[PDB]
């Protein structure tokens, strides 16, 4: 017997009830615009491979952001375009303004609404207690929306959250790894960055779902409240699970392996060892105690579970006490 199948606790069949066109992204026909409608101003520091650019729309003089798509399967391009189009106008989702090709090189590029080039990583180790809850709540709106729309992001990390702190404005960006959830579909586990990879990815359990994004959210939260970057600091993908095991303990790990009948890569057998589940108080100290509360810990604990089905959904997260004052203040303002 292979692995035991899994289904999402929420938004399970939403793509099935949609027209085929909603999710059959390979059949989507793109009307490619002309990139000469935009003049690039400067390269935005988004890493090495990345080719994001501040630019100007000549036609109306508005500032935009242009992402030159580095050569990759046309499949993957259509996927990112379709997801962005499907999620357009959703809470805290980056708006795709146009789809273009450079007339000479024919290289594909996506044109986005302007944001300040200040990602969450630059700000998220200097935030107040309140601001962490506020921005966590804002990320949760984007995730509940995209999940409700049948989409998992699969690359949630501080680098992919653009914050305008002056206007308290947040955009979840980089949907190039996002994918449509279909019950029973087995997915590629080579997604997300090391430190935010869910255990399902690490042990090679393929029938995963929206809950993946909630694990990554937990890693961000842990990092912010404990002022520890990253929280799970693995040398590689094998060691990454060891770092998780050293905090969450090995007992729940092996119970999770057994529950889903996961064949554990034999390489893991020597390295995981035996570890107790650590109390969060272990990571608290004078530098971070102002960010840490019972509510933060209870919330965090319910995100970081091996068993993907036992993690809070985005809507469940939004109803947690940790956000009560954020919710209260949002109602009045
Ligand atoms: Br800045 C920025 C970077 C991105 N990477 N992928 N999509 C993006 C959208 C914006 Br706006």
Curated annotation (Swiss-Prot):
Per its record, the protein catalyses:
L-seryl-[protein] + ATP = O-phospho-L-seryl-[protein] + ADP + H(+); L-threonyl-[protein] + ATP = O-phospho-L-threonyl-[protein] + ADP + H(+)
Record flagged with keyword Glycoprotein = no
Q: How is it modified after translation?
A: Phosphorylation does not directly affect casein kinase 2 activity, but may contribute to its regulation by forming binding sites for interacting proteins and/or targeting it to different compartments.
What the entry lists under Gene3D superfamilies is as follows:
Phosphorylase Kinase, domain 1, Transferase(Phosphotransferase) domain 1
As recorded in UniProt, coiled-coil segments are none
- Tissue spec: Expressed in gastric carcinoma tissue and the expression gradually increases with the progression of the carcinoma (at protein level).
Q: Name one GO cellular component term.
A: nucleus
> Which Pfam families does this chain map to?
Pkinase
User: What EC number(s) does the entry state?
Assistant: 2.7.11.1
What Gene Ontology molecular-function terms does this entry list? ATP binding; Hsp90 protein binding; identical protein binding; kinase activity; protein serine kinase activity; protein serine/threonine kinase activity
Query: Ranges for the Protein kinase domain?
Result: 38-323
Q: Specify the superkingdom.
A: Eukaryota
Q: Which UniProt keywords apply?
A: Apoptosis, ATP-binding, Biological rhythms, Cell cycle, Disease variant, Intellectual disability, Kinase, Nucleotide-binding, Nucleus, Phosphoprotein, Serine/threonine-protein kinase, Transcription, Transcription regulation, Transferase, Wnt signaling pathway
Which residues does ATP bind?
44-52, 67
- Main enzyme class: transferase
Q: How is this protein's activity controlled? A: Constitutively active protein kinase whose activity is not directly affected by phosphorylation. Seems to be regulated by level of expression and localization.
- Which Gene Ontology terms describe the biological processes this protein takes part in? apoptotic process; chaperone-mediated protein folding; DNA damage response; double-strand break repair; negative regulation of apoptotic signaling pathway; negative regulation of double-strand break repair via homologous recombination; negative regulation of proteasomal ubiquitin-dependent protein catabolic process; negative regulation of signal transduction by p53 class mediator
- Give the family this protein belongs to, as stated in its UniProt record: Belongs to the protein kinase superfamily. Ser/Thr protein kinase family. CK2 subfamily.
Entry-linked PANTHER family: CASEIN KINASE II SUBUNIT ALPHA, CASEIN KINASE II SUBUNIT ALPHA-RELATED
Add the further remark from the entry: Can use both ATP and GTP as phosphoryl donors. Phosphorylation by casein kinase 2 has been estimated to represent up to one quarter of the eukaryotic phosphoproteome. Casein kinase 2 has been found to be increased at protein level and up-regulated at the level of enzyme activity in the majority of cancers. However, elevated levels of casein kinase 2 are present in certain normal organs such as brain and testes.
The disorder on record is: Okur-Chung neurodevelopmental syndrome: An autosomal dominant neurodevelopmental disorder characterized by developmental delay, intellectual disability, behavioral problems, hypotonia, speech problems, microcephaly, pachygyria and variable dysmorphic features.
Function in brief: Catalytic subunit of a constitutively active serine/threonine-protein kinase complex that phosphorylates a large number of substrates containing acidic residues C-terminal to the phosphorylated serine or threonine. Regulates numerous cellular processes, such as cell cycle progression, apoptosis and transcription, as well as viral infection. May act as a regulatory node which integrates and coordinates numerous signals leading to an appropriate cellular response.
Please give the name of this protein.
Answer: Casein kinase II subunit alpha
Q: What is the lineage of its organism?
A: Eukaryota, Metazoa, Chordata, Craniata, Vertebrata
